[PDB]
Structures are given as C-alpha cells and as structure tokens.
Amino acid sequence: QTRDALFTAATELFLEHGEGVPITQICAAAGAHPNQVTYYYGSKERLFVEVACAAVLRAGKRAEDDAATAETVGDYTEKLVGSLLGPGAPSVELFTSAMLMTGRRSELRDLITDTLRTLHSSGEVALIRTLMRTGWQLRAGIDVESKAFWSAIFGLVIQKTATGESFGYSLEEAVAVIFANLQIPETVRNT
Amino acid sequence: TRDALFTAATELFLEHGEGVPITQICAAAGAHPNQVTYYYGSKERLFVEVACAAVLRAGKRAEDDAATAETVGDYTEKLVGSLLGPGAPSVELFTSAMLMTGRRSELRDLITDTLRTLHSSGEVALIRTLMRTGWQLRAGIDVESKAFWSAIFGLVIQKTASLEEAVAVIFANLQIPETVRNTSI
User: Could you tell me the CA-to-CA distances from B68 to A5, B78, B176 in Å, in that order?
Assistant: First the structure.
C-alpha cells in the first residue's frame, strides 16, 4: 500500500538515476514518511536490491511475453533479445549494479542469487526450449546454455551503456552477438 | 608521486570499491588531498583510470598464464581461469567503472579506449591460438571477441554473488568442436 507506493517511486527513480537517488526524494515521490522505508525494507540498500531484482525479472518476462507473440522462431529470438537489449536494458543494468554492490551481506546476496537462478530457469524453459523443440542442437546441457545466454545479455548491456551504444556495441551489434552465440540454422529460424 | 596515489588507490579500490574516501587513499600514499585534484581532476577520474589499468593488467596476466597451454582447450581454461580467478577483482572493478561513466566524455573515452584494447588483443589472441588447427570461427573475428568479453564481464559479475561452467559458456558461444579443443597449439 505505502509498501507499493515506495516500490513504484523507487523503481522509477532508480531506473533513471541509479542507486544515489536520496531516500527523501523516493519518500517525497511516494507520499511516504522516511520511517516507512525502514519499516518495509530495513534499509535503502535493501529497497534498491529488491527493486533491481523485480525490474530484471519483469524485464525478462516482458521479453519472453513479447517473443511468444509470434512465430517465427528467428523472430521470437529477435523479439526476445531486442526487448532485453532495448527497452529492458535499464532494468538489466540496474540488476548488474545491484550484483556489484552486494559483497557479502547474506540478506541481500540471497535476493540476488534467487533472482539469478530464476532468470536462468526461465531461460531453459522459454528460449532454449523454444529452440530445442524447433530443431536446434544443444552444444552444452540446457542449464549451461541458459547461463551463456544470460551472461552475454549482462555483458552486452553493460558495455552498450558504457560506450553510449557505439564502439561495436550499438543495439544492432549487441543483438548480432547473441545471434552469433546461438548460431541458429536458417531452417529453424524460419519455423 | 602521482604513482603513490595510483598505487594506494588501486589496492583500496580493488579491495573496497569506489566508496573508499579519498583521504584514506591520501593517507595510504602520504599525499595531500590537493594532489588528487592536481593529477586527476576528480576522484572518479582516478577511479576510472585505476580500473582501466587493472583490467589491462588482468588481461596481460591471463595471456601470460595461458601462453604455456598445450592445446586450444587448455589455453581457454587457463585464460578464463585467470580472468575469473586472480584477475576477477580487477575485472569487477572495471565493470563498476563502466556503470558509473555518467555520460562524461572524459570518463567514457577512457572506458572505450580500454575496451578497444581488450577486444583488439582478443581478436589477435583468438586467431593466434587457432592458427595450427585449420578450424575457422563461425562468425567474424570482431564479433567473436565481443562474445568473449561480454561473456567474461557477465560471468565475473555473477560470481561476485564455477570455472568449468564458465569455460563451457565460452566453448558454446564460440561452437568450438571437441577435437579443436584437443588440438595442440
């Protein structure tokens, strides 16, 4: 309720400006008292990590969702990768910032690790299954193929944002690296 | 003694990340806080400079560590083993530096120069590794170098919260056949 008001304001402000957004500005945005932050989240860092985790989960589902809408397979893949690298990029990028700032606070590491396992499960059952059932051959076990897909996504988002989408990491170029990683036969793509 | 600063900042950054206070760096190096504005202009520019140097140092260490490999797959294990092992802190710092550029040209230009170095050296190591084998990479050498580094940055960041898995990732993304992996170098 105020929980939700905080979460939304936090989400918008963090996605735009990163972890340095003062709490008072989130609270001003939410119509919340700074006390509700400590009540609902225990700390700013914990709000930030939860926001970052929900953002990337929601980004991954949006990509999978937008990909399910249509055949073809080449097109499912373009849609899925194009979503994560384009409109979902600030969410992936926040979650990368979150993974970097959680050294050893176990609270907080557990949110990260749970989020990572879910992204990786999600990739086995959406992308990698979409490929296998339409003809594509695993090069490694399905778990590893999901992780190869996700760590590419993380590294492409990071370098794309740092380079300002150039020096080899424009949107088109980053999409093409995922295509080269998957090397999906033309016949499979046309399904 | 820019270098006292650079040295102290590199150890403290590597260990604790960008939040290390600049006085703490100045106390480790016996410099005065003025010296940082002098030689670097900002703490962030010093941070970015240190992280850029650290990751280059890590890549050179990785190539050193892999230079005695006997086979392509041996080579890859040592290369990756090094970036995700001894070099992981330096890679993690450079990945932090990439996320904080804040659109500042002085900072982006350091990052992009450094990425270009890594990637060009990656193209060169890739082709030099595979020379003997008569096996040809599946996509363009430039695309392969990006796929290597994107994997590496994306893996190192996770470990932060398995080398066998990491090597298998590189193997898959590149589709290097088993017999190529076993081919001598």
Answer: 58, 9, 20
Contacts of A147 in chain B (CB under 8 A): 165, 169
Tell me, letter by letter, the H, E, C secondary structure of chain A: CHHHHHHHHHHHHHHHHCCCCCHHHHHHHHCCCHHHHHHHHCCHHHHHHHHHHHHHHHHHHHHHHHHHCCCCHHHHHHHHHHHHHCCCHHHHHHHHHHHHHCCCCHHHHHHHHHHHHHHHHHHHHHHHHHHHHCCCCCCCCHHHHHHHHHHHHHHHHHHHHHCCCCCCCCHHHHHHHHHHHHCCCHHHHHC
Q: Tell whether A117 lies on the interface with B, counting CB pairs under 8 A.
A: no
CATH architecture of B1-185: Orthogonal Bundle (1.10)
Does A28 contact B at CB distance below 8 Å? no
Q: Which fold has domain A1-191?
A: Tetracycline Repressor; domain 2 (1.10.357)
Scan residues 73-102 of A and list those with Cβ closer than 8 Å to B. Answer: 93, 96-97, 99-102
- CB contacts, 8 Å: A140 with chain B: 168-169, 171-172
8 Å CB contact of B146 and A177: yes
